[PDB]
Amino acid sequence: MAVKDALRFPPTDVTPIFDLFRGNFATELLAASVAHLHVFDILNESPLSLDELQRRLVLSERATQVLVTGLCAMQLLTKRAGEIDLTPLARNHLVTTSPFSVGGYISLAAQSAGTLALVERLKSDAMDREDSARFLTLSLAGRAWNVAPRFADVLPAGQPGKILKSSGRVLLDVAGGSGIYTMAVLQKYPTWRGIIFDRPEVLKIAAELAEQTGVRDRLELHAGDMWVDPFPPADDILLSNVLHDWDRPQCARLVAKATSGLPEGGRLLIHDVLLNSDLTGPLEIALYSLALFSLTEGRAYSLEEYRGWIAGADLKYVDCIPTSAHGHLILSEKV
């Protein structure tokens, strides 16, 4: 009887709380860059290409990108013509021989557990399994309840579906456990059907929430390994906060595999945050990217980067539509 409403917009915008919550990564990247990696003293000598800086810092491409993007977003580095240089603000205040340096003050955090953890991550690049997966899934679910109403509101209907025998569409939600985004879409589109594809420990949460939102009869839950197990037939495939967990080659692989099974007129829906096109900001996404770098194999990506993978899978890019909490729905179509 009672039905949880997944379409009502939240009464306030939670986004500033997420932005404040990332503040530690500003402190940690500052302390890592001043006191451990010598970034500012190195670049003060001369601007360097990204490849040159990678080499001089002895860091992976990914580690160098997230470091450079973070410091650019804090207005401390600048990107020319490819080269990376200090801004006057960094040159005057974060170079050790500047009379106005405050590097010693920043270095008061050099040995904090957070700074050391981030340095180790950069350089190296009591709960059981069920409780741990539930705890993490329910923690990310709070963001989904805030964003899924927007997401469902801005998702276009698309073509009549080709899987159900005018037909609704089948929406497959890959590694989007909680499945909340799909449940909102199914409340908006009563003729559609949804499929959540994820690990079994996560599907338990989806089963509960599908009952609460009253879409259980139009939702299937499939356990599977997204890299190797076949995706079920679907009109639309959603990758929501998935691709930023993965490094570049894995992103291209996942986009290709999802695309391979789409019918003509099927859609790949990428829902994620966006760095700007030269990976210099904005600040709140650059700090969130450091969190993703610390916890996963990926980072935040730009629209241009997503469009590279889309184009490599021979999909047609359609549109980019903001949701909330810095999310963007990138729509592409199988041709």
Ligand X SMILES: O=c1cc(-c2ccc(O)cc2)oc2cc(O)cc(O)c12
Q: Which residues bind ligand X (CB under 6 A)?
A: 108, 136, 241, 245, 295-296
Binds a copy of itself by CB under 8 A, chosen from 3, 17, 58, 207: 17
Smallest gap from Cβ 328 to ligand X, in A, equals 14
Quick note: the x/- pattern for a copy of itself over 67-106, rule CB under 8 A, is -------xxx-----------xx--xxx----xxxxxxxx
- Considering only 42, 145, 208, 232, the residue that binds a copy of itself (CB under 8 A) is 145
- Work out whether 142 is an interface residue with a copy of itself (CB under 8 A): yes
Name the binder of 157 from a copy of itself, ligand X, none, CB < 5-8 A by kind: none
**Which of residues 235 and 245 has its CB atom nearest to ligand X in the complex?**
245
Interface with a copy of itself (CB under 8 A), residue from 60, 78, 107, 276: 107
* Between 1 and 113, CB nearer to a copy of itself: 113
Q: Does 208 bind a copy of itself (CB under 8 A)?
A: no
Nearer to a copy of itself, 94 or 268 (CB): 94
Q: Which of residues 218-237 bind a copy of itself (CB under 8 A)?
A: none
Could you give the CA distance from residue 72 to residue 51 in angstroms, rounded to a whole number?
Answer: 16
Nearest-CB residue for ligand X? 241
The stretch near a copy of itself (CB under 8 A) out of 111-119, 218-226, 231-239, 307-315 is: 111-119
The 3-class secondary structure across the chain, one letter per residue, is CCCCCCCCCCCCCCHHHHHHHCHHHHHHHHHHHHHHCCHHHHHHHCCECHHHHHHHHCCCHHHHHHHHHHHHHCCCEEECCCCEEECHHHHHHCCCCCCCCCHHHHHHHCCCHHHHHHHHHHHHCCCCHHHHHHHHHHHHHHHHHHHHHHHHHHCCCCCCCCCCCCCCCEEEEECCCCCHHHHHHHHHCCCCEEEEEECHHHHHHHHHHHHHCCCHHHEEEEECCCCCCCCCCCCEEEEECCHHHCCHHHHHHHHHHHHHCCCCCCEEEEEECCECCCCCCCHHHHHHHHHHHHHCCCCCCEHHHHHHHHHHCCCEEEEEEECCCCCEEEEEECC
CB 323 within 8 A of CB 150: yes
Nearest to a copy of itself of 22, 188 (CB atom): 22
Binder among 7, 26, 154, 256 for a copy of itself (CB under 8 A): 26
Query: Which of ligand X, a copy of itself, none does residue 241 bind to, with CB < 5 to 8 Å depending on kind?
Result: ligand X
Binding site for a copy of itself (CB under 8 A): 4, 10-12, 14, 16-18, 20-28, 30, 74-76, 88-89, 92-94, 99-109, 112-114, 135-136, 138-143, 145-146, 287
